[PDB]
């Protein structure tokens, strides 16, 4: 008997729900009390909405309690007979003004420093006798002082955007809140400071030929002397000299950041001109050699969304028609990844035939986000209205799929497929993917989708506005404690914050978001977080408790997009 | 009915208590239940110890509940009829392994950066047309991006040690936990990284002539262009060109850090030789010109404790007898500050006549700490046994004074005197001091004293060991929520964390410790934290909610000393 809630709070003018975890499909009393937390007096009577089993999640039976129409600010909790929820807050831009500072502190806490950053001034390029100066940037995870543009390059369909995404997300934040007087001056300064710190690093990560180094990998040794520019593969981190980052391999996103970084009135250790050049150069180089840098030699959706962003950002900065033309092409290419099949319409396909769907535990939003950046700069109304309808259909999909089974928690669902298994709709990603091993929590994904929904509202019918308000909130709610494990994954907030590997001195950091909750280790249709079986297996326990900078970066853009939307 | 507890936990083999806040002097039933938090079954029956009123603290009536003899690890809470305490933990080195990481993250979060640090490369020296490169170090407070060796130099008896203390505390931490296998290798790396970052800054803060710059002050403007090397006075921060830091003005401590920094196998942006030189040079320069740099031209206790440390650290590093001789002199001088008067024995005197006692809301420990560093290096057994007895008597004092009135909370008491009041024993400092305005929370002071107790045990009888174990714990307990305001002052831990000025974007940072609780604003014998009267007055609300790097630094040394002691 648990009343699961957002451990932080709900928007005054926003969707609000909770979820009841119990034993039965119905109870005697069908009502829940919203109670003022100071006065302990009831302030609303709430109807329970029955549901029960969810996929095959062990914990028990789950039900929904909506209290959206309630719009009076303050602190409340839910009560149900004996049991009552944790206190939460209803206010305007609650998440933003509560967490934003701490998330940014996290980033500043995880800046590459000391021994490691000294060494990163003279880093071996694998297989050569060359060095590069690639100091700066952020350590990637609670237990990894390696620094990434991307990894899992070898699986092809999995490449997550890492250090670049951080930078671009931050710049994109500054963008939406420039002119917003409710965003404090010091708070704007802090976001520039961090963003430009990142930009500098991205600029340093570009080899003179025009490509960007993909990884600075230490094989998880925490050895200074093992820090090498490379790629790697498998869970044993076999290093390889394919360190050229293609569009999907984090290069596309690195261009987009540096182009946006160029538009700031201030700059970092490098000038605005320095950034823009590195962007333009880096783009036309990949326009030539992308395919040579792709492990399977075929561009997929990830390349398409990444490159579109790069072009959209370069046009904005330079106003040079070439880039609008390139955007237009990439957009048309991306719109082609919109596929319908015999059991679901307008899903995103990785492959061009529609045989393997797109699904991502990190950047799942970007398809729609990237199209929205295009729509923002596309003045020809034929092109606009075409790709407008793509964005509309893709959002209709996200809603359709997520509401096609019993889903009290509102957890965004997705179309997945394993290397050797059938296309199926799912809560979590296919564990049996091309990596051979890789799967973890999706907090990044959730916040990515949340961000997508908020940023798309400009280009969407007001028919589908309110539904996405809910979808996006339900995603965020999960991250901060409206989940079966009654666990806030944002550290230093809510309850039951998970740590990673304290006994080895690899702690989580306050303000960071951890990987999060996954499908069952043994049972794809169950749910798992640090399950007893594998909780102590250091080969597996990374999947849940460990923090990873994309989770934070997407959370940061989500809360800012949310703040802007109210 | 509140059962106040440590919001984190108690040592398995450590003193444990709670405090009952209620209405009455006695209750009907006189017993409290220690309850297992997982099984909800009783595990001990605890006697209440009656007390009632404390000084003139408004909240109500206070009683003690001791449960020290209970030594079974796990999670428990106290229950008393309907009401129960917050869950807490009993384990070995509980505070250290719970917080250490986060406190260090805080420091890395508060490193001087961005536009501010760029500007700190070319800082005007007030009244001249000179520049100094003083980039690095940590921002001083939640709402101050100025960087300090010390301030309140003008009041003479108030100078707190700031940036140097951080560095020295950290180095001193590394020292006690070198060889300690329970301190993770990565965790040692992080502490060096941060310490050496600090050392570099202290090295940069030394003008070539041999003195150190006292402050890098921006008049709280958060303006880049207002950053000037200077001193200042009053609450309006009137800048002045007396920027030479004497022994008490943070110079003594800066020497001590750089000397200890020289002993590390690794080094920062400057070499071990660079640090040692800056130390030796800086010392012999102050040995000459100290008096010229003191606002009132007279050395007081603060100079004596600061300089002793410097000498003790320089002897350890160089093994050059000159410094042991200097230590020996400073020690003899400091022992002279031990005074008895007609109502209290072996208090610390600021002035040489004993007319104004020493009391400090920051570094109150150092007298005894500095003598202990001397005792650590003093081989002549006459000198040792003399100053041994001083350290013994000074601790007997701290215990005597703190147990002379109804004191359920165990809050270390102190001998104070104002500009406008008689010598009196007190909980908090004299608000009516030489600053003209300055008084705040004493969390630094508490942790300073805790640290003192742990580090002194080597040189103390086992007769007075257990009492100081309790005193030190009772200090720490207060910081993390065993206080009338049921408030953990360590951010990201316990309950009711206070923020500072979020509406202006001057947030507290997770891992930091804030100023804390004070005497009543209107009533010296009451207690205050963000009281309604002054809570919104921005001229006064700094006194409570604001974070300040000494609180953190002393907390960090306390938890480390504690960890070492069990």
Short mmCIF file of C-alpha atoms in Angstrom, two decimals, chain B residues 190-508:
data_model
loop_
_atom_site.label_atom_id
_atom_site.label_comp_id
_atom_site.label_asym_id
_atom_site.label_seq_id
_atom_site.Cartn_x
_atom_site.Cartn_y
_atom_site.Cartn_z
CA UNK B 190 39.79 13.95 -5.20
CA UNK B 191 41.05 15.46 -1.94
CA UNK B 192 44.57 16.06 -3.33
CA UNK B 193 43.07 17.55 -6.53
CA UNK B 194 41.04 20.06 -4.47
CA UNK B 195 43.79 20.78 -1.92
CA UNK B 196 46.40 21.45 -4.65
CA UNK B 197 43.92 23.65 -6.53
CA UNK B 198 43.83 25.70 -3.32
CA UNK B 199 47.60 25.68 -2.78
CA UNK B 200 48.07 27.08 -6.30
CA UNK B 201 45.76 29.97 -5.48
CA UNK B 202 47.53 30.69 -2.17
CA UNK B 203 50.83 30.72 -4.12
CA UNK B 204 49.29 33.19 -6.63
CA UNK B 205 48.06 35.37 -3.72
CA UNK B 206 51.66 36.14 -2.60
CA UNK B 207 53.01 39.48 -3.89
CA UNK B 208 56.74 39.19 -4.69
CA UNK B 209 57.78 41.29 -1.64
CA UNK B 210 56.59 38.34 0.57
CA UNK B 211 53.16 39.39 1.92
CA UNK B 212 49.87 37.78 0.76
CA UNK B 213 46.84 39.69 -0.60
CA UNK B 214 44.05 39.63 2.00
CA UNK B 215 40.92 39.79 -0.16
CA UNK B 216 39.66 39.91 -3.75
CA UNK B 217 36.54 41.94 -3.07
CA UNK B 218 33.71 43.03 -5.37
CA UNK B 219 31.63 44.87 -2.72
CA UNK B 220 29.09 42.00 -3.24
CA UNK B 221 28.25 43.52 -6.65
CA UNK B 222 28.73 40.30 -8.66
CA UNK B 223 30.43 42.72 -11.08
CA UNK B 224 33.55 41.46 -12.86
CA UNK B 225 34.87 44.99 -13.22
CA UNK B 226 34.66 45.72 -9.46
CA UNK B 227 37.09 42.98 -8.47
CA UNK B 228 39.94 44.61 -6.52
CA UNK B 229 42.70 43.42 -4.21
CA UNK B 230 42.02 45.24 -0.95
CA UNK B 231 40.81 45.07 2.62
CA UNK B 232 37.43 46.44 3.72
CA UNK B 233 35.44 47.50 6.79
CA UNK B 234 31.83 47.83 8.05
CA UNK B 235 28.78 46.21 6.44
CA UNK B 236 28.98 48.67 3.48
CA UNK B 237 32.38 47.15 2.56
CA UNK B 238 34.45 50.34 2.35
CA UNK B 239 37.60 49.30 0.46
CA UNK B 240 41.11 50.28 1.67
CA UNK B 241 44.68 49.62 0.48
CA UNK B 242 45.81 47.81 3.70
CA UNK B 243 45.75 44.52 1.71
CA UNK B 244 48.86 43.13 3.41
CA UNK B 245 47.74 40.03 5.33
CA UNK B 246 49.33 39.69 8.79
CA UNK B 247 49.47 36.40 10.75
CA UNK B 248 45.91 36.76 12.09
CA UNK B 249 44.74 38.31 8.77
CA UNK B 250 44.95 34.87 7.09
CA UNK B 251 48.67 35.00 6.28
CA UNK B 252 49.73 32.65 9.04
CA UNK B 253 47.36 29.97 7.79
CA UNK B 254 48.39 30.50 4.12
CA UNK B 255 52.01 29.69 5.08
CA UNK B 256 50.93 26.55 7.00
CA UNK B 257 48.99 25.24 3.94
CA UNK B 258 51.74 25.85 1.37
CA UNK B 259 54.30 24.15 3.69
CA UNK B 260 52.09 21.05 4.08
CA UNK B 261 51.31 21.14 0.32
CA UNK B 262 55.06 20.85 -0.34
CA UNK B 263 55.10 17.41 1.33
CA UNK B 264 52.83 15.74 -1.26
CA UNK B 265 54.34 13.32 -3.84
CA UNK B 266 52.16 14.98 -6.52
CA UNK B 267 51.77 18.76 -7.06
CA UNK B 268 49.53 21.18 -8.91
CA UNK B 269 50.21 23.97 -11.41
CA UNK B 270 53.10 24.97 -9.12
CA UNK B 271 55.86 22.63 -7.85
CA UNK B 272 56.48 21.49 -4.23
CA UNK B 273 59.56 23.76 -4.27
CA UNK B 274 57.35 26.69 -5.43
CA UNK B 275 54.98 26.15 -2.42
CA UNK B 276 57.77 25.71 0.17
CA UNK B 277 59.58 28.85 -1.01
CA UNK B 278 56.37 30.90 -0.91
CA UNK B 279 55.92 29.55 2.66
CA UNK B 280 59.47 30.22 3.97
CA UNK B 281 59.65 33.65 2.22
CA UNK B 282 56.17 34.65 3.38
CA UNK B 283 56.99 33.71 6.98
CA UNK B 284 60.28 35.57 7.44
CA UNK B 285 58.68 38.60 5.81
CA UNK B 286 55.83 38.58 8.40
CA UNK B 287 58.39 37.88 11.15
CA UNK B 288 59.70 41.35 10.16
CA UNK B 289 56.58 43.39 9.19
CA UNK B 290 53.59 41.70 10.96
CA UNK B 291 52.89 44.67 13.24
CA UNK B 292 52.80 47.18 10.36
CA UNK B 293 49.98 45.08 8.77
CA UNK B 294 47.84 44.79 11.93
CA UNK B 295 45.08 47.44 12.08
CA UNK B 296 45.79 48.09 15.81
CA UNK B 297 49.54 47.21 15.68
CA UNK B 298 49.30 44.56 18.48
CA UNK B 299 49.59 40.76 17.98
CA UNK B 300 46.70 38.86 19.71
CA UNK B 301 45.78 35.17 20.23
CA UNK B 302 44.72 34.74 16.60
CA UNK B 303 48.22 35.67 15.35
CA UNK B 304 49.70 33.31 17.94
CA UNK B 305 47.63 30.22 16.94
CA UNK B 306 48.04 30.97 13.18
CA UNK B 307 51.83 31.51 13.32
CA UNK B 308 52.42 28.41 15.52
CA UNK B 309 50.75 26.27 12.83
CA UNK B 310 52.93 27.88 10.14
CA UNK B 311 56.10 27.07 12.13
CA UNK B 312 54.95 23.53 13.00
CA UNK B 313 54.27 22.87 9.29
CA UNK B 314 57.56 24.45 8.08
CA UNK B 315 59.61 22.36 10.54
CA UNK B 316 57.83 19.17 9.43
CA UNK B 317 58.60 19.95 5.77
CA UNK B 318 62.24 21.28 5.99
CA UNK B 319 63.46 19.65 9.29
CA UNK B 320 65.40 22.92 9.84
CA UNK B 321 65.77 23.57 13.61
CA UNK B 322 65.13 27.36 13.20
CA UNK B 323 61.40 26.63 12.78
CA UNK B 324 61.14 24.29 15.81
CA UNK B 325 62.66 27.17 17.82
CA UNK B 326 60.07 29.61 16.39
CA UNK B 327 57.28 27.07 17.16
CA UNK B 328 58.57 26.75 20.75
CA UNK B 329 58.39 30.56 21.19
CA UNK B 330 54.89 30.90 19.67
CA UNK B 331 53.72 27.98 21.85
CA UNK B 332 55.00 29.66 25.06
CA UNK B 333 53.26 32.90 23.93
CA UNK B 334 49.99 31.10 23.22
CA UNK B 335 50.06 29.24 26.56
CA UNK B 336 50.05 32.73 28.14
CA UNK B 337 46.55 33.33 26.67
CA UNK B 338 45.29 30.65 29.08
CA UNK B 339 43.73 32.72 31.90
CA UNK B 340 41.65 32.13 34.98
CA UNK B 341 39.39 34.84 36.41
CA UNK B 342 37.05 35.09 39.39
CA UNK B 343 34.20 33.00 37.88
CA UNK B 344 35.88 30.61 35.35
CA UNK B 345 39.26 28.87 34.98
CA UNK B 346 41.47 28.27 31.92
CA UNK B 347 39.38 30.24 29.40
CA UNK B 348 41.16 31.61 26.32
CA UNK B 349 41.90 35.35 26.36
CA UNK B 350 42.13 37.52 23.22
CA UNK B 351 43.82 40.45 25.01
CA UNK B 352 46.90 39.83 27.22
CA UNK B 353 45.29 41.09 30.47
CA UNK B 354 42.40 38.55 30.23
CA UNK B 355 39.86 41.40 30.10
CA UNK B 356 38.29 40.25 26.77
CA UNK B 357 38.00 36.45 26.31
CA UNK B 358 38.63 34.69 23.00
CA UNK B 359 35.50 33.49 21.25
CA UNK B 360 35.09 32.81 17.54
CA UNK B 361 32.12 31.80 15.34
CA UNK B 362 34.46 30.01 12.94
CA UNK B 363 37.91 28.92 14.17
CA UNK B 364 37.19 28.46 17.95
CA UNK B 365 39.08 25.13 17.91
CA UNK B 366 42.47 26.35 16.61
CA UNK B 367 44.12 27.35 19.96
CA UNK B 368 44.09 23.71 21.08
CA UNK B 369 44.57 22.30 17.53
CA UNK B 370 47.69 24.43 16.98
CA UNK B 371 49.13 23.42 20.35
CA UNK B 372 48.48 19.77 19.39
CA UNK B 373 50.46 20.20 16.13
CA UNK B 374 53.28 21.58 18.30
CA UNK B 375 53.02 18.65 20.77
CA UNK B 376 53.22 16.32 17.72
CA UNK B 377 56.74 17.64 16.92
CA UNK B 378 58.05 18.57 20.41
CA UNK B 379 60.51 15.94 21.67
CA UNK B 380 61.80 17.86 24.75
CA UNK B 381 59.62 16.37 27.52
CA UNK B 382 59.67 19.45 29.80
CA UNK B 383 58.15 21.65 27.05
CA UNK B 384 55.79 18.81 26.10
CA UNK B 385 54.46 18.13 29.62
CA UNK B 386 53.95 21.92 30.19
CA UNK B 387 51.84 22.57 27.08
CA UNK B 388 50.25 19.10 27.42
CA UNK B 389 48.68 20.42 30.66
CA UNK B 390 47.55 23.61 28.86
CA UNK B 391 45.74 21.51 26.21
CA UNK B 392 44.27 19.34 29.02
CA UNK B 393 43.04 22.38 30.99
CA UNK B 394 41.62 24.12 27.89
CA UNK B 395 39.53 20.99 27.15
CA UNK B 396 38.45 20.70 30.80
CA UNK B 397 37.24 24.33 30.36
CA UNK B 398 35.22 23.57 27.18
CA UNK B 399 33.50 20.76 29.08
CA UNK B 400 33.04 22.68 32.35
CA UNK B 401 31.45 25.76 30.71
CA UNK B 402 29.16 23.68 28.44
CA UNK B 403 27.84 21.61 31.42
CA UNK B 404 27.36 24.56 33.83
CA UNK B 405 23.67 25.19 32.89
CA UNK B 406 20.67 23.20 31.62
CA UNK B 407 22.08 21.97 28.26
CA UNK B 408 20.16 18.97 26.83
CA UNK B 409 21.44 19.64 23.28
CA UNK B 410 25.10 19.49 24.42
CA UNK B 411 25.80 22.71 22.45
CA UNK B 412 29.41 23.80 23.18
CA UNK B 413 29.26 26.96 25.31
CA UNK B 414 31.79 29.80 25.34
CA UNK B 415 33.06 32.79 27.32
CA UNK B 416 32.10 36.04 25.55
CA UNK B 417 32.15 39.79 26.13
CA UNK B 418 30.74 42.64 24.07
CA UNK B 419 31.63 46.25 23.42
CA UNK B 420 28.52 46.85 25.57
CA UNK B 421 28.44 43.93 28.07
CA UNK B 422 30.19 42.10 30.95
CA UNK B 423 32.11 38.83 30.58
CA UNK B 424 29.43 36.13 30.62
CA UNK B 425 29.23 32.45 29.67
CA UNK B 426 26.99 31.94 26.64
CA UNK B 427 25.62 29.62 24.00
CA UNK B 428 26.28 31.97 21.07
CA UNK B 429 28.78 34.79 20.47
CA UNK B 430 28.51 38.36 21.65
CA UNK B 431 26.33 40.03 18.99
CA UNK B 432 27.58 43.42 20.32
CA UNK B 433 31.22 42.89 19.21
CA UNK B 434 33.91 45.18 17.70
CA UNK B 435 32.68 44.63 14.09
CA UNK B 436 29.73 46.92 14.79
CA UNK B 437 27.33 44.52 13.01
CA UNK B 438 28.84 41.08 12.34
CA UNK B 439 27.40 37.93 13.90
CA UNK B 440 26.00 34.75 12.29
CA UNK B 441 25.67 30.98 12.77
CA UNK B 442 28.54 29.01 14.30
CA UNK B 443 28.39 25.67 12.38
CA UNK B 444 32.03 26.29 11.52
CA UNK B 445 32.80 26.87 15.19
CA UNK B 446 30.93 23.64 16.17
CA UNK B 447 32.82 21.50 13.63
CA UNK B 448 36.04 23.33 14.54
CA UNK B 449 35.60 22.28 18.19
CA UNK B 450 34.55 18.74 17.19
CA UNK B 451 37.74 18.51 15.07
CA UNK B 452 39.76 19.88 18.02
CA UNK B 453 38.43 17.14 20.35
CA UNK B 454 39.19 14.25 18.00
CA UNK B 455 42.70 15.51 17.07
CA UNK B 456 43.65 16.17 20.76
CA UNK B 457 42.91 12.59 22.04
CA UNK B 458 46.55 11.46 21.38
CA UNK B 459 47.74 14.07 23.95
CA UNK B 460 44.88 13.70 26.52
CA UNK B 461 44.30 11.42 29.53
CA UNK B 462 41.82 8.59 28.88
CA UNK B 463 40.02 10.09 31.91
CA UNK B 464 38.82 13.01 29.71
CA UNK B 465 38.54 10.98 26.46
CA UNK B 466 34.88 9.81 26.68
CA UNK B 467 33.55 13.28 27.77
CA UNK B 468 35.07 14.94 24.65
CA UNK B 469 33.70 12.07 22.47
CA UNK B 470 30.23 13.25 23.62
CA UNK B 471 30.94 16.99 23.41
CA UNK B 472 32.27 16.58 19.85
CA UNK B 473 29.31 14.40 18.76
CA UNK B 474 26.82 16.82 20.32
CA UNK B 475 28.40 19.62 18.27
CA UNK B 476 28.12 17.64 15.02
CA UNK B 477 24.60 16.38 15.85
CA UNK B 478 23.41 20.03 15.94
CA UNK B 479 24.80 20.78 12.47
CA UNK B 480 22.86 17.88 10.87
CA UNK B 481 19.47 18.34 12.60
CA UNK B 482 19.61 17.74 16.38
CA UNK B 483 18.63 21.38 16.95
CA UNK B 484 15.40 23.18 18.05
CA UNK B 485 14.60 24.05 14.40
CA UNK B 486 14.61 20.32 13.36
CA UNK B 487 16.84 21.39 10.49
CA UNK B 488 19.83 19.74 8.82
CA UNK B 489 22.17 22.62 7.83
CA UNK B 490 24.20 20.30 5.53
CA UNK B 491 22.51 20.73 2.15
CA UNK B 492 21.19 17.58 0.39
CA UNK B 493 20.91 15.70 3.70
CA UNK B 494 18.43 15.41 6.58
CA UNK B 495 15.27 17.55 6.54
CA UNK B 496 14.27 21.21 6.21
CA UNK B 497 17.41 22.30 4.36
CA UNK B 498 17.34 26.14 4.28
CA UNK B 499 18.01 28.05 1.04
CA UNK B 500 19.43 31.60 0.99
CA UNK B 501 18.23 33.98 -1.77
CA UNK B 502 16.82 31.85 -4.63
CA UNK B 503 14.65 34.71 -5.98
CA UNK B 504 17.93 36.51 -6.92
CA UNK B 505 19.59 33.30 -8.17
CA UNK B 506 21.95 33.12 -5.18
CA UNK B 507 21.17 29.51 -4.21
CA UNK B 508 22.79 27.32 -1.59
#
